[PDB]
């Protein structure tokens, strides 16, 4: 009996560490770079995440002709969650909220990378109601290439996002009448 | 007997240290940056921690248009505590003091990433009865992007933290006048 | 009995460990560069992938005389798929859309590395139809040194793959009266 | 028996092993600085350690708007004690010598970091008598941030001390009148 | 019985781990260069590996006065199989196409290092046709130092290769009259 | 019996490998700064060890205004010595010689750093003599920080050692009318 | 039987493993340079190796005030032979060809390092015929220093070799009149 | 029987190992400058080792105000023998040849470090009749620091030796009328 215990427990413990150095070890992180060409300035940066977290902060504000270059990343240590959130600007020069969405999940079995972007009215921070509202409410876009979207009031945008899983995502926001990049 | 006690022995021995070798390696860091814009000169500047240590000190003074950069992190080894903590400045020119509180937990099931900051009357060194009344009595910030507060006397904050754990605390103290960052 | 058991369960688990350690360290990967002396710019860079992915994206667009630079790679982790895919661009000043193709499969021993490109009609985003078509239905271009072929409306491009399975996958897309390279 | 007397002393060496490589790497130290802007020549560094050792020697003297920077540490090896010690310069100009103390202790559960500064008359050695002087009998400073003590003879300083264990000393001593840093 | 049937496997994957992870480490590359002091533009670069690879791709032509670096190697993992391959270019100021040789076995108990180069009639890939007559019937070079040898319609060729197995083979092709090197 | 001796002999090998390791790196150096202020050549630099080496030769001479560096360290290997000896100088311009001694030891529970000078009339190599003179019966210095002495002839010294075992020992040669540093 | 049968195998391929991995580790090679002092050019430079190879060629031809730089070594993997071979240029401004031999062996018990160098009339490849003539009929030199010695038609050398194993061999060919080096 | 056979053959495989990687650890060298202040052209450099070896040659010669740098050291391996050996030059301007012999012995408990120079007669290659001549029957001197003594013809030398093991010896050959270093 207690050698084979013993032995048992072992085994059990070196298939448990091999589990959790794997999950600890797939990694997931989604570099979003939005470019801001709306001749409008941004401002009051809020974010939320269904899951992972990122490092530093949003800029308070991007203005005309700037970057918002932000890294958002999986929750540390074992766990199989990916990185899914949503980054909101106000837009004050037309009253309106610019929102994103990306989505980098752990199971690719089940999952896709996805992202989309909106316009909402008035001043809000981002939160599950515009989570829910940018990936299954408003068509999100998949990590095929490069896709492009009126926005309303003057703007529109056009982005991509790369299938990898270490993802970038990359859009520019314009003033509607421009080419894009 | 005596063979299985040696083989139950080695193997307690083992998880022990997987525990421990966890628990001193499961980090967590909140790096402040706290931006004197102000127009006034802060002075005498104190700490209390809650739980965590820093290894540098606190500037003595940060004068108009300089910045409080502080790297404070858990304490160090197998120990299951984050990095809560407060620091505080005199502020001479408006008889009041900043204090500045952030808590960057060990266990994000029973806990998140929180900030807070106030002026009090007088000069007072950071201890516990300036935590409890920034993180319980006070209404805390979320660590969900950047959020606008005034202070009175004519100050105001602008500011956010990341959610990361090994987190960025980022504020910007201004004339309430003044336009965020 | 038992003691068996786990000494050839600690047996097929270390066989089990180098199985997935085999087959994630058989590296698939193609450097694709395309350079375009077309003389017309090409925009809205699309892609599919029959097996692996990249973490770039394309750029939006490549102007005359630039090149795309894209380096797509296998699915991460021990999966025995080669990387295989499409890229495409629109060419609005032929009412046009180039593709290419490449594979750079996992098992040579039934697989070889091939690529293709053609111009198909209007504006497409790149998917399995253009799979197919490009690895079977037009004559594909094994990886065998340097190959050229027009594309109608005043095109050509002269190209080559290396057989490494660390390849890399050259193109110049040329006016058909000019010398390549 | 025996075949269990020797694993048990293989399992006995292991965790004496264990504790002395714990102890062994469980660092102490207190970087010193000390700066001098008191108007007066420093002379003949004398320095004592109730615990702990450094590499280089004190300057002979510091001179007026120079600092001395001090690196004392824990004795090496498996030992349990902190760093803790009295650094003594005699000030001709007015007839004293400055002490300056710091502790920084192994065990956390019983002790803090402390550190004290005190002018002495005549010129002395730093010793044990001083070291009980300014740990016990003179009010010593937490590591809690800025402190700020005249001296008598026309000197102050201000200063604090870092609560980390791998802390920090700073002390800036100062004709009475001048305002701290 | 199955104690030892579960040992002599241990030993058995043993001895296969040695015996693929010294034929994954014997490595066998052939650091190609041919110069081009011909007077005439080669183009149209064509390969051809009886056994080996490459990661880059021939240059599409070789200007006059310029070389062609190239670094053909065995097939990755535990393979025992060395690098052999032919070369090619069209010289269209002549009607001829340009033919390079290497041989860089496995098995230097059997083989030895060869190479060899020819001109034939018009415009040609590299294949077998011209590995096997390159090899054999024309009358290949050791790895014993500088040979020079006529090619016809007023070429000619010096040069050698290494006997290491990481080799380097080097040709300086040449008008007739010309000095080598 | 012959199994668990020879399972004693691998446990008491174990210790013999940990004792010798030990004590193969339990380092003790003591880095000697001499800085010559005197006014005169000091030449025929001669050193005797009591305990230790060193590496590098002393200079053959230090002319007014430069330094001895001197790197000495104890025997390599697993030995349970300190660094302990001494150094000299003839000063003809006054037809004396200076020696230097320091001692380093092994065991802190017994021995503490130790040094010494002293002129000694005419001309004589470092020996044992020197050694029992400076160590016993001339007065030695701790290592507690800077001690000053006269050394007759017109000359004095101030000096300190550092108390480490890591040690640096620095001493100032100087005219006795002269400020020290 | 068959327990002691597999912890015998275990234990001899421990000690095959050791034996491959000194013959593999036990290094030799022959850093030759050979420098061109004659007035005279050399070309057609033909190599033969009695043991090992090098990984580079022989320039084609060194010219007058120019040097031969080689670095042969033995044969990779555990092998137990050493560097030998023969290096040959022609000079046909004398109508002779130059060889230069060493020999850098594996077994010091029976061997010792030595070189020599001749010329033969005409042109000639290096090969066995020149290793046994500068070897045994022709007086080789040891490596003990530098030696001189006359070529006929008007040149000399002198030159030296290493002792190591892994040798520099260097040698000035030079016109009989001039003072080496 | 055969299970403690293989048990004590892997002890004893064990302790060899242990014997063979200190021998092979145990390292001696002995960096040899000598610099010619002598007034007189060197030439001819000649070496001979009673142990250990050097990797690089001697200079040819060593002009006026010119120095032999020299780095002989053990033979390498698990060998118990130190560096030994004999260096030396013609000077032709004297009709005389300067040697200078080394010892750096493994055993210092048998052994110390030892160096000689003296100028024999005539041109001379270095042998064991100068080691024997310079290590025994002239008076050598031991690594205690600098010693100063005359060659006759007009020469002396100065020098020193340090008592490391990994040594350097450093000498200083001069007319005799010049003041040492
Ligand atoms: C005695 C025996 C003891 C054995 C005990 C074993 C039980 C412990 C296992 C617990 C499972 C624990 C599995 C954990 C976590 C979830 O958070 C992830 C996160 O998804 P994402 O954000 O990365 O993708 C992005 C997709 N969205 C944009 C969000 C839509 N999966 C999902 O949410 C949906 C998959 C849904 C998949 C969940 C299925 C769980 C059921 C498993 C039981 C069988
Ligand atoms: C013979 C048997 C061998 C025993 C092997 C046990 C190894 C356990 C390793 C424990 C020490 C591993 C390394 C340890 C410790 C110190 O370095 C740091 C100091 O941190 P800081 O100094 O940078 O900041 C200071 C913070 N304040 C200033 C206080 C605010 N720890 C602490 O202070 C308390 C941590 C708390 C650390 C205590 C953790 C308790 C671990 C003991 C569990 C015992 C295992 C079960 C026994 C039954
Ligand atoms: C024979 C068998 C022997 C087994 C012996 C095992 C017992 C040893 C375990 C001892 C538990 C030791 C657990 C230790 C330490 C606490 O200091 C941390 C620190 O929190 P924070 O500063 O990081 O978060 C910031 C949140 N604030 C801003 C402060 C509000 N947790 C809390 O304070 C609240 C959680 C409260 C959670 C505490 C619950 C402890 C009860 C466990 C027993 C079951
Ligand atoms: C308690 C027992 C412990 C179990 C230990 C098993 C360890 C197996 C390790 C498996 C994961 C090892 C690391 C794994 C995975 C992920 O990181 C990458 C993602 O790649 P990419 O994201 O960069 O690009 C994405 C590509 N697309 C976007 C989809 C196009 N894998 C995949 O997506 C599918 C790979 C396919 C990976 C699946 C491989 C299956 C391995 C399971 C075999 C189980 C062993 C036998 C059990 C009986
Ligand atoms: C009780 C015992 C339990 C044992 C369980 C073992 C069963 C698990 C094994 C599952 C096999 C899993 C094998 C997996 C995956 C395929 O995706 C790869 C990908 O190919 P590529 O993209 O890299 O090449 C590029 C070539 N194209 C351009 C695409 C044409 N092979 C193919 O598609 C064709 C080969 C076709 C080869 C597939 C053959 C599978 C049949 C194996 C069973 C025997
Ligand atoms: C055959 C058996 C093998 C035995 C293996 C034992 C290994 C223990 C390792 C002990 C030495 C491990 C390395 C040791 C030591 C020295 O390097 C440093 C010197 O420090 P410093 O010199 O830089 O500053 C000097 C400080 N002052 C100047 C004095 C003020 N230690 C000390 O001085 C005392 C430390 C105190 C160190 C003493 C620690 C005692 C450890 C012994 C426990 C024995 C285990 C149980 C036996 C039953
Ligand atoms: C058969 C069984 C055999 C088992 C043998 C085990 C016995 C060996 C253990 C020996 C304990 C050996 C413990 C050693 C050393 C002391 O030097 C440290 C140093 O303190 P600091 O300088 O770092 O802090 C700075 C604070 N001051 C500024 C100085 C006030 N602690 C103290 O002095 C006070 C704590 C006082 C704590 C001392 C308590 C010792 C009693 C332990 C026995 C239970
Ligand atoms: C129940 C027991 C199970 C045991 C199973 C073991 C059998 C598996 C072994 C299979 C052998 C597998 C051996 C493999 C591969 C060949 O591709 C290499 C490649 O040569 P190269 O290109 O590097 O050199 C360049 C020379 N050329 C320029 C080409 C002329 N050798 C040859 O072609 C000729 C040697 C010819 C040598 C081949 C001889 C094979 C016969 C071995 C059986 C004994
Ligand atoms: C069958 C059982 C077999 C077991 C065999 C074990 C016996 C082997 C052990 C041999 C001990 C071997 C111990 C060795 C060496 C001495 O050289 C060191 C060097 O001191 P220092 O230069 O570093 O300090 C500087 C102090 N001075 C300036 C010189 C005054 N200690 C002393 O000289 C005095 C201590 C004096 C301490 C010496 C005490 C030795 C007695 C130990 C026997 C118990
Ligand atoms: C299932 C069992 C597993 C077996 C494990 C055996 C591992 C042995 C490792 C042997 C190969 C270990 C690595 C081996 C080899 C090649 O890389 C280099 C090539 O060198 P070069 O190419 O740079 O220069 C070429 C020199 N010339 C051009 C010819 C002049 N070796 C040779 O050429 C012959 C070396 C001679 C190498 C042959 C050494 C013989 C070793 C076999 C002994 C077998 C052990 C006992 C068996 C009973
Ligand atoms: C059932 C038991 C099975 C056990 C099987 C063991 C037998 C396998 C061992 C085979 C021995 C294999 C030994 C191998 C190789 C020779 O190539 C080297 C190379 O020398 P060099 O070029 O480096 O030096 C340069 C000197 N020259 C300039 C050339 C004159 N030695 C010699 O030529 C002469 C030594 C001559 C020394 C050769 C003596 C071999 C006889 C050994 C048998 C005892
Ligand atoms: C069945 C049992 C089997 C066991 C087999 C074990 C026997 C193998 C051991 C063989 C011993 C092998 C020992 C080897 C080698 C000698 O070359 C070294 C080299 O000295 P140096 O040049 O570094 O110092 C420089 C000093 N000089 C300037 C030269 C004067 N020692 C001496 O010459 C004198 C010491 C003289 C010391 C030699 C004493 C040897 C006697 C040992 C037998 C007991």
Same mark, same amino acid.
């Not at 009996?1 to 560490?17: M, S």
């Not at 939320?48 to 540390?76: H, I, M």
């Given at each position: 009996?207690?050698?084979?215990? +013993?032995?048992? =427990?072992?085994?059990?413990?070196?298939?448990?560490?091999?589990?959790?150095?794997?999950? =600890? *070890?797939? *990694?997931? /992180?989604? &570099?979003?770079?939005?470019?801001?060409?709306?001749?409008?300035?941004?401002?009051?940066?809020?974010?939320?995440?269904?899951?992972?977290?990122?490092?530093?902060?949003?800029?308070?504000?991007?203005?005309?002709?700037?970057?918002?270059?932000?890294?958002?990343? /999986?929750?540390?240590?074992?766990? #199989?969650?990916?990185?899914?959130?949503?980054?909101?600007?106000?837009?004050?020069?037309?009253?309106?909220?610019?929102?994103?969405?990306? $989505?980098?999940?752990?199971?690719? *079995?089940?999952?896709?990378?996805?992202?989309? #972007?909106?316009?909402?009215?008035? *001043?809000?921070?981002?939160?599950?109601? !515009?989570?829910?509202?940018?990936?299954?409410?408003?068509?999100?876009?998949? &990590?095929?290439?490069? !896709?492009?979207?009126?926005?309303?009031?003057?703007?529109?945008?056009?982005?991509?996002? $790369?299938?990898?899983?270490?993802?970038?995502?990359? +859009? !520019?926001?314009? /003033?509607?009448?421009?080419?894009?990049?």
């Amino acid at each position: 009996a207690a050698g084979t215990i +013993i032995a048992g =427990a072992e085994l059990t413990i070196g298939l448990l560490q091999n589990l959790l150095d794997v999950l =600890a *070890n797939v *990694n997931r /992180k989604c &570099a979003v770079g939005v470019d801001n060409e709306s001749g409008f300035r941004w401002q009051e940066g809020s974010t939320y995440f269904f899951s992972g977290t990122a490092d530093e902060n949003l800029p308070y504000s991007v203005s005309d002709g700037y970057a918002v270059l932000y890294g958002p990343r /999986k929750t540390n240590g074992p766990v #199989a969650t990916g990185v899914v959130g949503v980054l909101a600007y106000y837009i004050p020069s037309i009253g309106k909220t610019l929102a994103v969405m990306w $989505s980098v999940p752990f199971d690719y *079995n089940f999952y896709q990378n996805w992202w989309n #972007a909106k316009l909402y009215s008035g *001043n809000q921070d981002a939160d599950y109601d !515009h989570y829910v509202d940018l990936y299954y409410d408003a068509n999100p876009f998949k &990590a095929n290439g490069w !896709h492009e979207r009126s926005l309303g009031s003057g703007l529109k945008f056009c982005g991509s996002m $790369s299938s990898s899983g270490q993802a970038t995502l990359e +859009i !520019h926001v314009l /003033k509607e009448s421009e080419t894009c990049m």
